[PDB]
Amino acid sequence: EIITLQLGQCGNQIGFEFWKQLCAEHGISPEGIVEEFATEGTDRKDVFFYQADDEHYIPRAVLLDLEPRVIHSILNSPYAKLYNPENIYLSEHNNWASGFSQGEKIHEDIFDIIDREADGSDSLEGFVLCHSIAGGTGSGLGSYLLERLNDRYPKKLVQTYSVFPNQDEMDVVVQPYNSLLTLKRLTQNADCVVLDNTALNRIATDSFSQINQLVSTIMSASTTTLRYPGYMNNDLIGLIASLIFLMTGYTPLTTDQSVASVRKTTVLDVMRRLLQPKNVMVSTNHCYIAILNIIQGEVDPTQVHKSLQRIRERKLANFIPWGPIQVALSRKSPYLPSAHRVSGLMMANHTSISSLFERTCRQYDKLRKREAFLEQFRKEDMFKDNFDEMDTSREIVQQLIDEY
Amino acid sequence: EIITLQLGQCGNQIGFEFWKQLCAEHGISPEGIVEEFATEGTDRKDVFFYQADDEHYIPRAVLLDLEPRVIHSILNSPYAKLYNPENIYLSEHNNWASGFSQGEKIHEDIFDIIDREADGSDSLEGFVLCHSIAGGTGSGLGSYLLERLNDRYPKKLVQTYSVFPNQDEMDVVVQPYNSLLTLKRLTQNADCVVLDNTALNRIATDSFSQINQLVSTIMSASTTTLRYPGYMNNDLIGLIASLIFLMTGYTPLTTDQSVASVRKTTVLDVMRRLLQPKNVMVSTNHCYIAILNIIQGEVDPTQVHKSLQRIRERKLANFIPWGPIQVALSRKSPYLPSAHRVSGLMMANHTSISSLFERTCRQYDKLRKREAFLEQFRKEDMFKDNFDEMDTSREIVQQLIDEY
Amino acid sequence: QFSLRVEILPSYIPVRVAEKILFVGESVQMFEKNQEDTFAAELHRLKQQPLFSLVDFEQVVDRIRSTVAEHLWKLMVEESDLLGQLKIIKDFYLLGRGELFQAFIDTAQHMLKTPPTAVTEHDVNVAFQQSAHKVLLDDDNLLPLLHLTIEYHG
């Protein structure tokens, strides 16, 4: 089992479309009813859903937000009735310090909800977090929740889908501070999926609805095998151990109109495609640390071995000199059309990601020398006296970059 | 069997809606007739009702009041004909002393009615009292009746649903005196359910009709197993022995419009919910003395054992260091819809209740130093000479607080 | 009430079918269409076989067994309602209706702490009868069928 903590407008939407994808996959009706064709289903549902006496299924989700508008719109959707009104929380009434201050203020009810959800699962495995690191809501609230959660639950995993601000595009003027602080908290508490609007929209090209549909696709494909038990990799901890910051790529990212080119898609061509920098959805002979490829559809392990052999000989990849990939196979949901003969998802750890922080650090250093937009931060208690928090966070990020 | 003594406007209403709930549960028509579908009923009716030669059932209730208006309205309700006109009593023509003086004045007819009702039951078990402690009517009249009843019937139980005045809201200006005196009498004569408008309306939020509907729900759920015989806890004395001041909480306190969220409701989640201070309908490492949870609907004792084990390990509760809970199961009435898969009611004794009196004492001490609103009290005979009654009552309450 | 014999039972015949025979018959003697003649043809058929084949002896017994058992279950549940009767045993034997006993214990208490004599047997049957009426259980059925016993003088 698992819980999802989605914050800010970004996280709220991310959750909306993630649950849309899930209910599509598992044959769950918008109202929580189960379709007749899926009555005898074999798919495991406990992982993301828990059924109710009324036979309906409820997501293990909690909605958090500093503002009402987004969730109010969500509850006007056809999927509104599905969620649990008890879990959803809205502030009665764009800065990280303010977000953390509110988090300190509203500890009690949030952790009440989290405890209630936790006690309903026998074998909870970890946590899932969806949020954006730039905006005031996501950054600060995620920081506070991560801190108090790692404190509260020292034996549960914490996984996040953190969305990083666009850089080529000059959105949050105060983004460097929030990003740097959120990164501090991620290193200091997060167990383990980086995301950026820049490269994501780049691949989308070459509305937020479609972008986050792709993101939800990534999340669902990541959790597929856990959802669909097989032989190997039957747990999230198995995933994490096989890799341990990450980046992702998915081959069949094709529009509903781009099915006309039914290209004979082997496993070799897919696994190859997952390697190119173009497909890496995120934007010094930098090299890899780990690679995992989850493959959906018919697959012959002989083909997998041949592809691995050929790629190894062709040396299209580079590895650490000081240490000695993985190809897991799953089964598609029996419901969604198998427009793709075989499909592939890749999650990897690669040193080049360091550059991200070097940019943000460069951004942050490009402001701290002139004290820009610190007036609001001084208002909150945390930065009321000084900003030693900022210095510690910057040095922590520098240490991480040095370690990479 | 049992008798109900309801005083003051509060008690009169409380009784109205309590009997409404009872007749709804047992399939008793508003006029006292029995519905065709309930002809072969198995539910025990003697406990709260006695049938009549005309086949109608009459409650074992007595109406008392210093004023006519409330009961006159009651007798204009569709339920008017149900009650016994003989038992109902109305004064022909807001202070505790006046109430007790009248009680001394109208001893004869009240005890005539009580004796008549008592002699109609073979195995009367105790008494039930519903009243408010602030207003003049309820406080004084209940005091007098409790005194003369404990004197008259030294072998019957005396149970009360005492409503305490709101404190956050500044209603009876002379409330401290009436409350303190009623508490004196309760300690000195009452066998055994505290109630406050503040927290009750708080939970209602988060007219008197709905508040007292909830209160009647609490009373009926408390008396369920007695009404519906089973294996264990087949008597009120069994209830009292298993606990012995109290506070209460009920999980499925859901509006008629809030059934849309049909949440899969185990026994574990319910019994857990009954523990939180939020659900405790009333408003130094204070701890518990006793806990009882009555559960309605399908229940597996294995689930109960598992819930008890897990809660014990999670140590969500605190107990006295000097002494070594209880979970009883009942069956729902076969008539009212089972909108809840399993439901839970909790009655507990907890030391924190002491604070209540500390407030009222603080209130009373905040007046006795300046002799506020004593003019009316001096009028009555009881406080005609002095107010030693007040001093004794205050010291008794102080002794009780020290004992806690 | 019949029995079975082992000291005279054949050798090659297993006891399993012997038990099957003992039940299929007693279920008729106690019990006092087409399911009668057809089996007579089956038994007669075996008399023509020039070799006793146990593997076939059971295929005629078990069908006869399952038919009477199916016919007996039809009566033991549908016609003669067992559920109602079991519901009576759970209530009174296993203290299912405990609310009746707490009153009976409340009344018939002083008359049992004393050692038992020849008169206490009736001194309780009345108190138990006073009890069922005291819980407004009015049913002349199944009321006289319950008779408390007093193991006196041995």
Swiss-Prot record, chains A, B:
An example GO BP is: meiotic spindle organization
Which residue spans traverse the membrane?
none
Spell out the InterPro entries in the cross-references.
Answer: Gamma_tubulin, Tub_FtsZ_C, Tubulin, Tubulin/FtsZ-like_C, Tubulin/FtsZ_2-layer-sand-dom, Tubulin/FtsZ_GTPase_sf, Tubulin_C, Tubulin_CS
Q: Where in the cell is it found?
A: Cytoplasm, Cytoskeleton, Microtubule organizing center, Centrosome; Cytoplasm, Cytoskeleton, Spindle
PTM info: Phosphorylation at Ser-123 by BRSK1 regulates centrosome duplication, possibly by mediating relocation of gamma-tubulin and its associated proteins from the cytoplasm to the centrosome.
Do the record's keywords include Nucleotide-binding?
Answer: yes
Q: Name one GO cellular component term.
A: cell leading edge
Tell me the keywords, alphabetical order.
Cytoplasm, Cytoskeleton, Disease variant, GTP-binding, Lissencephaly, Microtubule, Nucleotide-binding, Phosphoprotein
Q: Where along the chain is GTP bound?
A: A134, G135, G136, T137, G138, S139, G140
Give the principal location in a single coarse category. Answer: cytoplasm
Where in the sequence is Phosphoserine found?
S123
Q: Name one Pfam family in it.
A: Tubulin
GO MF terms listed in the record are: GTP binding; identical protein binding; microtubule nucleator activity; structural constituent of cytoskeleton
Q: How does it assemble?
A: Component of the gamma-tubulin ring complex (gTuRC) consisting of TUBGCP2, TUBGCP3, TUBGCP4, TUBGCP5 and TUBGCP6 and gamma-tubulin TUBG1 or TUBG2. TUBGCP2, TUBGCP3, TUBGCP4, TUBGCP5 and TUBGCP6 assemble in a 5:5:2:1:1 stoichiometry; each is associated with a gamma-tubulin, thereby arranging 14 gamma-tubulins in a helical manner. Gamma-tubulin at the first position is blocked by TUBGCP3 at the last position, allowing 13 protafilaments to grow into a microtubule.
Q: Which family does it belong to?
A: Belongs to the tubulin family.
Briefly state the protein's biological role.
Tubulin is the major constituent of microtubules, protein filaments consisting of alpha- and beta-tubulin heterodimers. Gamma-tubulin is a key component of the gamma-tubulin ring complex (gTuRC) which mediates microtubule nucleation. The gTuRC regulates the minus-end nucleation of alpha-beta tubulin heterodimers that grow into microtubule protafilaments, a critical step in centrosome duplication and spindle formation.
The illness linked here is:
Cortical dysplasia, complex, with other brain malformations 4: A disorder of aberrant neuronal migration and disturbed axonal guidance. Clinical features include early-onset seizures, microcephaly, spastic tetraplegia, and various malformations of cortical development, such as agyria, posterior or frontal pachygyria, thick cortex, and subcortical band heterotopia and thin corpus callosum in some patients.
Per its record, how is this protein called by name? Tubulin gamma-1 chain
Swiss-Prot record, chain C:
Q: In which tissues is it expressed?
A: Ubiquitously expressed.
Q: Where in the cell is it found?
A: Cytoplasm, Cytoskeleton, Microtubule organizing center, Centrosome
Q: How does it assemble?
A: Component of the gamma-tubulin ring complex (gTuRC) consisting of TUBGCP2, TUBGCP3, TUBGCP4, TUBGCP5 and TUBGCP6 and gamma-tubulin TUBG1 or TUBG2. TUBGCP2, TUBGCP3, TUBGCP4, TUBGCP5 and TUBGCP6 assemble in a 5:5:2:1:1 stoichiometry; each is associated with a gamma-tubulin, thereby arranging 14 gamma-tubulins in a helical manner. Gamma-tubulin at the first position is blocked by TUBGCP3 at the last position, allowing 13 protafilaments to grow into a microtubule.
Q: What does this protein do?
A: Component of the gamma-tubulin ring complex (gTuRC) which mediates microtubule nucleation. The gTuRC regulates the minus-end nucleation of alpha-beta tubulin heterodimers that grow into microtubule protafilaments, a critical step in centrosome duplication and spindle formation.
Q: Please give the clinical condition linked to this protein.
A: Microcephaly and chorioretinopathy, autosomal recessive, 3: A disorder characterized by congenital microcephaly and chorioretinal dysplasia associated with poor vision and nystagmus. Variable ocular anomalies include microphthalmia, retinal folding, retinal detachment, optic nerve hypoplasia, absence of retinal vessels, round areas of chorioretinal atrophy, and attenuated electroretinogram. Most patients have mild developmental delay and mild learning difficulties.
Task: Give the family per the record.
Answer: Belongs to the TUBGCP family.
Protein's name in the database: Gamma-tubulin complex component 4
Q: Which organism is it from?
A: Homo sapiens
Q: What lineage does UniProt assign to this protein's organism?
A: Eukaryota, Metazoa, Chordata, Craniata, Vertebrata
- The encoding gene is TUBGCP4
Complete-protein stretch covered: 256 to 422 of 667
